[PDB]
Design an enzyme around this catalytic site. Structure first.
Site, PDB file in Angstrom:
ATOM      1  N   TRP A 130       0.852  -1.184   0.000  1.00  0.00           N
ATOM      2  CA  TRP A 130       0.000   0.000   0.000  1.00  0.00           C
ATOM      3  C   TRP A 130       0.887   1.233   0.000  1.00  0.00           C
ATOM      4  O   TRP A 130       1.861   1.284   0.747  1.00  0.00           O
ATOM      5  CB  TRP A 130      -0.904  -0.050   1.240  1.00  0.00           C
ATOM      6  N   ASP A 211       0.015  -5.480   9.734  1.00  0.00           N
ATOM      7  CA  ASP A 211      -1.046  -4.651   9.189  1.00  0.00           C
ATOM      8  C   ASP A 211      -2.163  -5.605   8.768  1.00  0.00           C
ATOM      9  O   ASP A 211      -2.000  -6.407   7.824  1.00  0.00           O
ATOM     10  CB  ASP A 211      -0.513  -3.836   8.018  1.00  0.00           C
ATOM     11  N   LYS A 246     -13.030  -2.400   5.776  1.00  0.00           N
ATOM     12  CA  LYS A 246     -13.573  -3.262   4.740  1.00  0.00           C
ATOM     13  C   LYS A 246     -14.522  -4.332   5.330  1.00  0.00           C
ATOM     14  O   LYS A 246     -15.624  -4.527   4.807  1.00  0.00           O
ATOM     15  CB  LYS A 246     -12.438  -3.958   3.980  1.00  0.00           C
TER      16      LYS A 246
END
Ligand SMILES: Cc1ncc(COP(=O)(O)O)c(CN)c1O
Ligand SMILES: Cc1ncc(COP(=O)(O)O)c(CN)c1O
Lengths: 396, 396
Positions: A130, A211, A246
């Site tokens: 990311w 993460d 999400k």
């Protein structure tokens, strides 16, 4: 004071979005999106979330500040998701959780905490990752170094290159791992590869930073935490930055967590007191509404069941699109195998298209992906799959 | 890595709170609180807020991410509150607003923006101030210097001392001003004093940073912004960190704004692009629910009217307690002037009690204030005023 400030670099994301909106063509398609969409092309509020929001509207009698670390139930539910009910980490009170504004907020809290209270100077991130990982860590004054990850020939984890890269990491460096559904590749370590990495990390003196933004989107809630839990079993210390953006469809309510793990309860409490100071000096205390929806759902048997099934429906729809994409492409004409798409995890995969193929797809066919070739398979539907695939085949 | 971390300093706030909770005496009283309470001792959700939350429950169809700078309507409404409808700053597009997680979040974004993109090294803060000001600026690597403010003899603004203090500020230093309702003193510049400071700031090359957390709690929404608007009329550049925590009773939803002002639209847009970069690397984008409530209310005539009156009700109740406190102290035999309390603004005033009197209050009478002598007059009610004042008179 401001007359000579240099403008921030372009931002390809906002970016891609604006060009897509401006595009007047039928039937343009946006695979560059970073969120889940259902079969109708919408990103709805989850039903479980609406039900929880109604309950909060009915029952909240104050907006008085949360503690610095947020809602206690949110913290407990979060640790059970990460480590498993009955985990030794939980039993031994070795973990402290701060509710944060999203996974990004958790990463920045971790980074500020480490920069101010430890000797950490460097964070190792996969290439690719990311793109905001480098920005977050650099913002706290930490250097970011990259480790090898992607085998572009086999569209697999280049495990040997990974291990080789990371031998340059010094003891006391942070190594960041995506818990599941690696962004952008969708390629995750196998459990055995996680266990090898856990052993290597202990030997080399790395501080692991997980993460964990897509728990539940690879194989399932418990399965997706296998890698993290293999690391947790082997390490005295680690940090988890998790996100509910999400898997609860709560993107804009900024719901995440920073979980700190140390060898024992005295050590983690002492260290967490400085993590709370880092929060206090940033945004003071975290936004209640999204986290309260999460705590409300996770701690209620009826709501949790509805939510778990909505999350399963998302995971399954992504898998159906992965299968439908491979079938539609290349049983009807294409390149050196796209079956790697079926094995990858989560919303994202590198398509294998070049930056120029991606540009040609945008310009000639109105199909939008990110320049790296990453596509969001949740931007795919049964209805748009044939034109999407016809366009891709045309630029091969 | 965590074994040698030093615990964060004690936290007197949590702190005072815990001691108060544990106290088993009737009728203990907490004046150390940092929020509004009504006449029943509660901190309700405002009715306008509940109505807006119902509307959002009914009408939201997605939680998709906001832009980095949040809800556009929230930004427009915020600038109209700060600068006034029809302000030249607005007409000339010289101001850009980012929605932030509370006023604290706005201050940290301002500090990060300044540390990374300007030559700012130093921020001047009044002595006394909100204790988190130093932590926020230091977190971004900025030194904090104090300027004189309080005349402890006359319970007034020591204007001479202030101006003398600030002459040590160099050109290019930031000077922070509380917009109204100075925390902890309730002592604000008069409009003429604001105008003098605005002139001095221009001459000395200071960058003004307004901390505007209590708009509406001194005299009214427009009146409370006079000081800021006097500065805005005189300066090319400034920053405002505003908060909706108190004036919408939205504390835990983390609703504030960072407003950047530059000489023209080209300059402010270029500079704001780096403010957005600073946000991106921190919490990515801001929490929707609280700010959406604020935008929904401010942009709707019916809701805005209900909200303005609730805010007026809070301001007036605070003023009634200030009057009742002075009257009741007189009636319980304090043989000294507390009339300064009537002229101070907002929830807070220094009582004039010493740190030992404050400790004696807590220990012998179960009346809790901050060690500085700051009391929150919204913790006062007609029912608890007599015992409160009897206890105070007893330690004089
Ligand atoms: C790997 C990774 N890390 C963190 C984030 C940020 O998540 P959030 O929107 O909750 O800040 C994302 C995007 N969901 C991501 O893909
Ligand atoms: C002067 C000052 N600045 C900022 C804050 C922080 O406000 P918030 O809770 O919105 O972050 C406070 C407390 N309201 C304050 O008194």
């Amino acid at each position: 004071m401001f007359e000579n400030i240099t403008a921030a670099p372009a931002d390809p994301i906002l970016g891609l979005a604006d060009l897509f909106r401006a595009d007047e063509r039928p039937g343009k398609i946006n695979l560059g999106i970073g969120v889940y969409k259902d079969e109708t092309g919408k990103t709805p509020v989850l039903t479980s979330v609406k039900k929880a929001e109604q309950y909060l509207l009915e029952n909240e009698t104050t907006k008085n500040y949360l503690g610095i670390d947020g809602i206690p139930e949110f913290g407990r539910c979060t640790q059970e998701l990460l480590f498993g009910k009955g985990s030794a980490l939980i039993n031994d009170k070795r973990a402290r959780t701060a509710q944060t504004p999203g996974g990004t907020g958790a990463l920045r809290v971790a980074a500020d905490f480490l920069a101010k209270n430890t000797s950490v100077k460097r964070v190792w991130v996969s290439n690719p990752s990311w793109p905001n990982h480098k920005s977050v860590f650099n913002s706290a004054g930490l250097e970011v170094r990259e480790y090898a990850y992607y085998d572009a020939e086999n569209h697999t984890l280049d495990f040997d290159a990974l291990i080789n890269s990371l031998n340059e990491a010094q003891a006391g460096d942070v190594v960041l791992f995506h818990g599941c559904c690696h962004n952008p590749t969708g390629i995750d370590p196998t459990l055995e590869q996680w266990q090898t990495l856990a052993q290597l990390s202990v030997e080399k003196g790395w501080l692991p930073l997980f993460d964990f933004a897509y728990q539940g989107f690879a194989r399932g809630l418990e399965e997706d935490a296998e890698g993290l839990r293999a690391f947790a079993a082997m390490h005295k210390e680690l940090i988890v930055a998790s996100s509910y953006s999400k898997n609860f469809g709560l993107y804009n309510e900024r719901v995440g967590a920073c979980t700190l793990v140390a060898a024992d309860s005295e050590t983690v409490d002492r260290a967490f007191s400085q993590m709370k100071a880092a929060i206090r000096a940033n945004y003071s205390n975290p936004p209640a509404h999204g986290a309260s929806v999460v705590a409300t759902i996770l701690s209620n048997d009826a709501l949790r069941a509805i939510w778990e099934q909505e999350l399963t429906d998302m995971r399954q729809r992504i898998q159906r699109m992965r299968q439908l994409f491979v079938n539609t492409l290349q049983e009807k004409g294409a390149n050196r195998d796209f079956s790697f798409i079926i094995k990858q995890n989560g919303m994202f995969s590198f398509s294998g298209l070049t930056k120029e193929q991606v540009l040609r797809l945008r310009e000639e066919f109105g199909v939008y992906a990110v320049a790296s070739g990453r596509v969001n398979v949740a931007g795919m539907t049964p209805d748009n799959m044939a034109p999407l695939c016809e366009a891709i085949v045309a630029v091969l």
